[PDB]
Amino acid sequence: HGEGTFTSDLSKQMEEEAVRCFIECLKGIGHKYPFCHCR
């Protein structure tokens, strides 16, 4: 698939984790995503 690198603070640029939960947690959704730790 090539280098499809999802970074987790490693580059802190195009991150998937803690942003894909962040904007959703802002709305109010709990654990929709594996890495989404929203209450």
Side-chain angles (χ1 to χ4, degrees):
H1 300 119
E3 55 177 81
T5 313
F6 298 97
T7 42
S8 307
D9 180 76
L10 186 165
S11 302
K12 195 177 183 298
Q13 299 177 331
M14 191 288 294
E15 309 302 281
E16 183 179 88
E17 53 72 79
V19 299
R20 280 291 69 233
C21 179
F22 188 81
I23 301 297
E24 312 292 50
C25 187
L26 192 166
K27 302 180 182 63
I29 59 80
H31 297 239
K32 179 178 177 295
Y33 306 79
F35 50 87
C36 183
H37 288 234
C38 186
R39 299 177 64 184

